[PDB]
Design a protein around this ligand. Structure first.
Ligand SMILES: O=C(O)c1cc(C(=O)O)c2c(n1)C(=O)C(=O)c1cc(C(=O)O)[nH]c1-2
Ligand SMILES: [Ca+2]
Ligand SMILES: [Cl-]
Ligand SMILES: [Zn+2]
Ligand SMILES: [Zn+2]
Ligand SMILES: [Zn+2]
Ligand SMILES: [Zn+2]
Length: 562
């Protein structure tokens, strides 16, 4: 019935033109994480009730209810993909991939899945075994699949999910446990043919190779692009970011002094070809697993940064002050520094720290980052008191945009990392080859935090704090609300103007996944994926007074009483 008269998903849908739907991870191509739906607002949110819910597969539950014309498309863990009636919560179809023994996968991160993608009459995802897979949206039955290579025992996978642009499925990758780097690919959405593949680690003698400190090519590991991909239709530019290299210590890498061209770089590329239009390295010489791979938003804003705003690192030499620009903006790396660029040219406008950070000594008026020499992991076994941590700061949990107030709303953790490089030799299995203790940032008694930053001035308008880590995405809405989950298991709504909590419900486990909103027959629904991720186990022990249990993975859906 719900699936019956399925209409093909177009670029108009994916650009977020129909606010009744949420047909892409952040509601629109541009990465806003916003629903224009305004039925639910601060005056009635207190009445929100559970309408329906459904159990999801076990494991790290970071996915999103992709809603389209009354149907929820839902990536579970373990390559289980569901269509669910968005009104009743009844299963419509389920695809369950045949998996080899989990022990065969060296990269367990590929079990989690932040999104599927929609285009035409197909659902698109990347499997744990590193295939781009297309299912029939109407039935969940496989239409085609294409092996990208190096899956399973070789550890290339994907955790964020693809987007489809101009008939091209664009998907990044994680190779966290591999003795090599990885890539972003574009795949034809109808034929399944790989059209292009962009890599990051320079080959010997090629542009950037001299920034790797002499490290043999085969010793350059783990540089990937595992975060969220965004897109601007008008400019026709796809945006993604690459990550760092392992192990964390440049001494152990053999890259002393190396700024590591290709790593932690923000790329703007043409969707059909992968051609790089512009790029900017947001964290050079990474010794801190900084991963500048997180979603970056395309918004139009007046440009007027305050050099005295809290955390402001620097303002661009050629900042077009007072002018309105389409910008690429947000926090790309775990470090928690917000950046703003001209979306078309990559001209640097400004950058601004949020959480306590000590990896970046300065950023000059061109956007050139100089790292803090004191935090380079130069002596194995020495404890370096890094701020933030290998989980931020920010991490994958996405920001939201409030277009009425021009606020960028980002969930953050007030944590620092007492980290040391192990004294034993690093292998790819060892990842960053570090041991660490996580602590609250200096003078902070609240681990969970949400900052709302004015994109014109860089001023923080409000900041919400709570005892335990949030480590969960935000949803912003046209009802002037911000929804966010936490490891305290609360799913809460904040007043978008003040940051003050106006409603909450407590879910059975840490609220670990995305929140989306859609409507059916005029009724607004708010859907959250819950149960647990790496967040609770990591941040929970710092605030053991909070009951941060994981469990009961599911989608949980709320609405006002009929
Ligand atoms: O370097 C990589 O390839 C890679 C992949 C992943 C993943 O795909 O989830 C994470 C990280 N890195 C990472 O550094 C990190 O802190 C992290 C947290 C999470 C999560 O699910 O909470 N995934 C990942
Ligand atoms: Ca990583
Ligand atoms: Cl529609
Ligand atoms: Zn449509
Ligand atoms: Zn630049
Ligand atoms: Zn100011
Ligand atoms: Zn509450």
């Amino acid at each position: 019935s719900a699936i019956e008269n399925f209409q093909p998903v177009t670029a108009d849908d994916l650009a977020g033109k129909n606010p009744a739907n949420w047909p892409i991870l952040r509601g629109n191509y541009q990465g806003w994480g916003y629903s224009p739906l305004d039925q639910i607002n601060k005056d009635n949110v207190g009445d929100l009730q559970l309408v329906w819910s459904r159990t999801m597969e076990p494991g790290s539950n970071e996915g999103a209810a992709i809603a389209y014309n009354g149907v929820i498309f839902l990536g579970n863990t373990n390559d289980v993909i569901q269509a669910i009636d968005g009104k009743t919560g009844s299963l419509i179809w389920e695809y369950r991939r045949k998996l080899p023994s989990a022990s065969k996968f060296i990269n367990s991160l590929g079990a989690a899945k932040r999104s599927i993608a929609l285009f035409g009459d197909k659902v698109y995802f990347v499997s744990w075994d590193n295939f781009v897979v297309a299912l029939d949206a109407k039935t969940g039955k496989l239409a085609w699949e294409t092996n990208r290579g190096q899956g399973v025992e070789e550890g290339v996978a994907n955790s964020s999910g693809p987007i489809v642009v101009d008939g091209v499925v664009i998907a990044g990758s994680t190779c966290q446990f591999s003795g090599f780097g990885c890539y972003v690919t574009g795949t034809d959405a109808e034929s399944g043919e790989e059209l292009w593949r962009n890599t990051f680690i320079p080959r010997p003698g090629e542009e950037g190779d001299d920034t790797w400190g002499g490290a043999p090519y085969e010793n350059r590991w783990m540089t990937g692009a595992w975060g969220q991909i965004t897109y601007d239709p008008e400019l026709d530019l796809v945006y993604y970011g690459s990550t760092g290299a392992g192990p964390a210590s440049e001494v152990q890498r053999g890259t002393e002094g190396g700024t590591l061209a290709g790593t932690n770089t923000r790329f703007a590329v043409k969707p059909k070809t992968g051609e790089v239009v512009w790029k900017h390295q947001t964290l050079p010489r990474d010794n801190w697993d900084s991963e500048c791979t997180f979603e970056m938003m395309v918004v139009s804003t007046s440009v007027n940064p305050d050099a005295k705003a809290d955390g402001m690192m620097s303002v661009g030499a050629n900042v077009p002050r007072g002018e309105t620009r389409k910008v690429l903006t947000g926090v790309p790396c775990k470090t928690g520094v917000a950046w703003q660029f001209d979306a078309k040219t990559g001209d640097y406008f400004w950058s601004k720290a949020t959480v306590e950070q000590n990896s970046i000594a300065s950023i000059d008026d061109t956007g050139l980052v100089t790292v803090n020499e004191d935090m380079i992991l130069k002596e194995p076994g020495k404890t370096y008191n890094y701020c933030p941590t290998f989980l931020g700061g920010r991490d994958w949990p996405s920001a939201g945009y409030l277009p009425k107030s021009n606020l960028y709303v980002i969930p953050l953790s007030n944590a620092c990392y007492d980290v040391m490089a192990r004294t034993t030799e690093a292998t790819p299995a060892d990842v960053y080859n570090t041991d660490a203790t996580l602590v609250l940032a200096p003078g902070k008694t609240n681990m969970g935090r949400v900052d709302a930053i004015d994109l014109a001035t860089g001023e923080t308008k409000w900041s919400y704090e709570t005892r335990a880590a949030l480590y969960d995405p935000v949803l912003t809405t046209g009802g002037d609300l911000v929804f966010v989950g936490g490891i305290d298991r609360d799913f809460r709504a904040l007043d978008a103007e003040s940051g003050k909590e106006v409603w909450s419900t407590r879910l059975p486990g840490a609220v670990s996944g995305y929140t989306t909103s859609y409507s059916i027959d005029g009724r607004q629904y708010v859907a959250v994926v819950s149960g647990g991720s790496l967040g609770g186990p990591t941040f929970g022990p710092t605030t053991p007074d909070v009951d941060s249990a994981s469990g009961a993975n599911g989608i949980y859906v709320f609405a006002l009483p009929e």
